[PDB]
Amino acid sequence: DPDIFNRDPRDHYDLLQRLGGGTYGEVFKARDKVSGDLVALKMVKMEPDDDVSTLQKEILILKTCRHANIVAYHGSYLWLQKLWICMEFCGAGSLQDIYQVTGSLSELQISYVCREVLQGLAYLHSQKKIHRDIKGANILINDAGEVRLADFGISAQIGAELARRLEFIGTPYWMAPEVAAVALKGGYNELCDIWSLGITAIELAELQPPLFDVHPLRVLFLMTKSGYQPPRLKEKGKWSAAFHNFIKVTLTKSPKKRPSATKMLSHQLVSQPGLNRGLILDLLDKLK
Amino acid sequence: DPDIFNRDPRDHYDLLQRLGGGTYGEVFKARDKVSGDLVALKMVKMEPDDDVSTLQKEILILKTCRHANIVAYHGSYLWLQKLWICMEFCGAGSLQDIYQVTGSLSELQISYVCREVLQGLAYLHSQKKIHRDIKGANILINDAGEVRLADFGISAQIGAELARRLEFIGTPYWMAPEVAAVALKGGYNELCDIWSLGITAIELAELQPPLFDVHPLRVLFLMTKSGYQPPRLKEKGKWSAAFHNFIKVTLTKSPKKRPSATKMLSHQLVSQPGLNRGLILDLLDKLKN
Ligand SMILES: CCCn1cnnc1-c1cccc(N2Cc3c(cc(N(C)C)nc3CNC)C2=O)n1
Ligand SMILES: CCCn1cnnc1-c1cccc(N2Cc3c(cc(N(C)C)nc3CNC)C2=O)n1
Numbered sequence: 001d002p003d004i005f006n007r008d009p010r011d012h013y014d015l016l017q018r019l020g021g022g023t024y025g026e027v028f029k030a031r032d033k034v035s036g037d038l039v040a041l042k043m044v045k046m047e048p049d050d051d052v053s054t055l056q057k058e059i060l061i062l063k064t065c066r067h068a069n070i071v072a073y074h075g076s077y078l079w080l081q082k083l084w085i086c087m088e089f090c091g092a093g094s095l096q097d098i099y100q101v102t103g104s105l106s107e108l109q110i111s112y113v114c115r116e117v118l119q120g121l122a123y124l125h126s127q128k129k130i131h132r133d134i135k136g137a138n139i140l141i142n143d144a145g146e147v148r149l150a151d152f153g154i155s156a157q158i159g160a161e162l163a164r165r166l167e168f169i170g171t172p173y174w175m176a177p178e179v180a181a182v183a184l185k186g187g188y189n190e191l192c193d194i195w196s197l198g199i200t201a202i203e204l205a206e207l208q209p210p211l212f213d214v215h216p217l218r219v220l221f222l223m224t225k226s227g228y229q230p231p232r233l234k235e236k237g238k239w240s241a242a243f244h245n246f247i248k249v250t251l252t253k254s255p256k257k258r259p260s261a262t263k264m265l266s267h268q269l270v271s272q273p274g275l276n277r278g279l280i281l282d283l284l285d286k287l288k
Numbered sequence: 289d290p291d292i293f294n295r296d297p298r299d300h301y302d303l304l305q306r307l308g309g310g311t312y313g314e315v316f317k318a319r320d321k322v323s324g325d326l327v328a329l330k331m332v333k334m335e336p337d338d339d340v341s342t343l344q345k346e347i348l349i350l351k352t353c354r355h356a357n358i359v360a361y362h363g364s365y366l367w368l369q370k371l372w373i374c375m376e377f378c379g380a381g382s383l384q385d386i387y388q389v390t391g392s393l394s395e396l397q398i399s400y401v402c403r404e405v406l407q408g409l410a411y412l413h414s415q416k417k418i419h420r421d422i423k424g425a426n427i428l429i430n431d432a433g434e435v436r437l438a439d440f441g442i443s444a445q446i447g448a449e450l451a452r453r454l455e456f457i458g459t460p461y462w463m464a465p466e467v468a469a470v471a472l473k474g475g476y477n478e479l480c481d482i483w484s485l486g487i488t489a490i491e492l493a494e495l496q497p498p499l500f501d502v503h504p505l506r507v508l509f510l511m512t513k514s515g516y517q518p519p520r521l522k523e524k525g526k527w528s529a530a531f532h533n534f535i536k537v538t539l540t541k542s543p544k545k546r547p548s549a550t551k552m553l554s555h556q557l558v559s560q561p562g563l564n565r566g567l568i569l570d571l572l573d574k575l576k577n
Contacts (some may be wrong), residue, residue: 023458135462154458161453170311170442172507174423175495176483178543179338180511187470195464209461219460223468255466 001059002075009041009086011269019093023133023153024054027091038089039074046083053164055083060155061129062087069120071140071150087150091143092284094150095204096136100267102286106205107243108272112138112279113204116147117197117269122261124149125190131155134196136203145280162186191258198250202231205239228253242269289347289364297329297365297372307381310443311344317377318451326377327362333553334371341452343371346444349417350375357408358521359428359436378428378436380572383492390574393492395531399429400567401492402534403558405485410549412437413478419443424491433565450474473566479546486538489518489531494522506512517540530557 014028016038020027025044032039044055061071062085067129072088092098095113099105105113117139124131133154140148162184169175169183203209210231213220222228230251233239246269252258264270301318308315309510313332320327332343350361350373360376380386383401387393393401405427405504411421419426421442428436450472450541457463457471491497498519499507510516518539532556540546 133458133462134466135459136543157456165449165507166508168445170421172424172504172511173500174421174484174487174491175443175508175511176476176480176543177511177516177541179420180508182470182475184508184512187475188464188466192464192467196462199462203462212461216460220454220463220472223460223463223465224472228465249304253465255464 001056001063002151003063003075004077005075005077007077008082009077009084013039013041015041018107019267022151023157025085029215038091040087040089042083042087042235044083047076048081051160051164053160054153054156055085056144057159058152059085061152062154064127064145065124065129067120067123069116069147069149070123088142090140090148090150092141092145094137095139095141097282098141098252098287099207102283103281104207106279107205107239108275109279109283110201110204110243111269111272112275112277113147114197114201115265115275117149117200117234118261118264118270119229120147120149121190121193121197122265125193125261126261129155130190131193131196132158133200134193135200137272139200141280141284143284145277147280158186191255191260194250194258194261194264197264198247199231201250202233202241205233205235205268240269242267245269250271289344291351291363292506293363293365294367295365296367299375301327301329303329304429310439311445313441328359328375328377328415330373330375331571332371332373333369334366335369336473339448339452341448342441342444343373345447346440347373349440349447350572352415353411353417355408355411356434357404357436358411359438369510375434375438377430378438379431380429380568380575382386382425382438383427383429384424386571386575387492387495392495393571394567395527396563397571398489398492398531398561399557400563400565401435402485403553403563405437405488405547405555406558408435408437409478409485410553413481417443418446418478419481419484420446422481423497427488428574429568430443431572433568435568446474477543479543479548482538482546482549482552483540485552486535489535489538490519490521493527509552511559522559528557530555530560533557 012033016029016031019029019040025042028041030039039162040229053244059076074086076086077084117134119227121131131149133151138149138151140150142148166183172180199209230253233244233247249259250264301320303316303318305317307317307328313330315328315330318327318329334343347364362374364374365372405422409419419437421439426437426439428438454471460468487497518541519534521532534555537547538552
């Protein structure tokens with residue numbers, strides 16, 4: 001990263017508590033030694049022998065995002081084989097941290113979260129970025145009740161992998177166009193995020209994604225079977241027709257028929273005039 | 289592997305000549321100390337901490353092939369951080385080695401090679417195997433003028449890659465079905481080899497594949513564009529309508545419409561009589577004289 005701080009952030013911050021992991025690295029809550037401002041520091045072990053591509057892509061994504069629904073980026077430090085990504089501290093943690101305490105979210109709270117995530121996704125997709133890891137654990141809530149997408153580790157790993165593989169995929173001159181297409185584009189597109197959002201909406205309503213207790217490898221196989229049916233909400237009577245329809249359309253099996261983030265923003269569920277931060281601030285009130 | 293020889297291959301063979309590289313490793317001409325038979329030994333560096341999955345997959349591909357048009361497999365040796373794969377030796381080298389001396393092949397010579405490669409591809413595809421690196425450099429010729437496909441390095445790497453990637457692709461519960469599909473199936477199928485054969489037929493005719501002067505990364509981009517026109521032979525009048533048609537159909541852009549290896553074996557260009565190894569023996573006489 002051209003803007004890296006070649007200094008130890010511990011000279012400027014006190015590490016207060018561990019905030020868990022993620023795709024890679026350890027996240028800490030940190031307080032500025034003088035200002036008192038709180039930040040999240042994601043520490044990753046570096047080495048002169050280690051490939052910097054993944055971290056380089058993650059920093060590039062975060063630094064070029066300037067949107068209210070994407071975690072803010074403050075800079076990165078490099079000192080004594082440790083890289084520290086400095087980001088916005090989100091006081092309420094992830095939606096998973098929240099629902100594990102409060103129980104299932106109400107339909108209005110899920111509708112607001114969905115609107116906010118779709119705003120973030122519409123922005124990412126407009127910058128030709130794909131999150132590829134949407135789930136309750138990657139949707140953060142700050143004390144202000146703001147919804148922020150986080151952890152671009154999978155997105156960074158995918159992008160770095162696609163670029164790294166190119167040298168070894170073989171000679172392009174004799175390559176079939178469909179092989180070149182998967183080499184450059186990966187075999188899918190940004191609409192994979194829309195599906196993940198539909199699953200996240202079931203997770204917020206039910207406290208688990210569909211097939212949560214099934215071995216992760218068997219899930220992959222089940223999903224590729226020709227008979228695979230998109231998941232549905234379990235408690236039909238609890239939810240409005242708009243919510244069932246939101247699940248139906250975001251979980252469109254064919255990606256050619258699945259609606260874009262911008263199209264989804266006009267959906268009846270997420271375009272309700274009454275959706276506001278008050279819904280989340282209420283959720284944080286229950287947390288206390 | 290319980291079939292590997294845990295010994296120096298020089299106990300059994302004398303190394304005679306360097307035969308170049310390939311996708312990975314170095315190949316040598318060798319002579320069996322007991323029988324005097326010639327073989328090719330491919331030596332690959334294999335450290336104790338290195339991933340064995342690619343080489344395991346290459347030997348599995350080779351060992352379960354029993355078809356004249358695929359180099360025979362004799363066995364493998366592991367010794368002093370080197371893995372040696374023992375295969376059939378092909379006395380005239382690759383078609384690329386040959387045409388760099390002889391110049392362009394004749395249409396009958398091309399037809400015979402295409403038939404032979406198609407027979408090997410029909411067999412591979414019958415086993416759910418994909419070559420994925422068909423080109424003149426990988427079509428080997430023996431002193432009898434017989435044709436063998438070689439170098440499953442790319443095929444082995446793709447197979448090892450699919451299995452290795454799986455653990456790191458992220459949680460599956462929130463994943464879109466198309467993400468899971470590409471993770472388990474790859475994104476394309478065996479018909480990629482039919483396209484590669486068509487490009488190879490142009491290569492044998494013109495001494496290089498289409499777009500060879502273009503930067504390889506730019507070639508990848510050009511092929512991914514909607515509107516990419518499949519390439520054609522340059523000199524229209526020099527080639528029969530049958531040969532131009534063979535190129536047109538093997539280079540069908542949509543893989544859903546591209547014919548199989550078995551389908552291509554019924555094409556008049558490769559089903560014509562007079563297609564035999566004597567055509568390549570003529571080519572080898574040109575190489576010598
Ligand atoms: C995807 C989250 C990790 N991550 C992976 N890449 N960038 C980040 C990242 C980025 C910015 C903030 C944060 N976090 C995470 C977190 C936070 C607070 C908190 N509280 C107050 C209980 N809990 C947790 C998480 N608990 C399990 C917080 O500010 N994380
Ligand atoms: C396909 C490329 C190598 N390879 C990669 N995986 N398996 C193999 C492989 C397997 C079996 C034989 C052979 N070869 C290659 C070769 C030969 C002879 C020869 N002569 C007499 C000049 N020249 C060359 C190649 N020259 C550039 C021969 O028998 N190779």
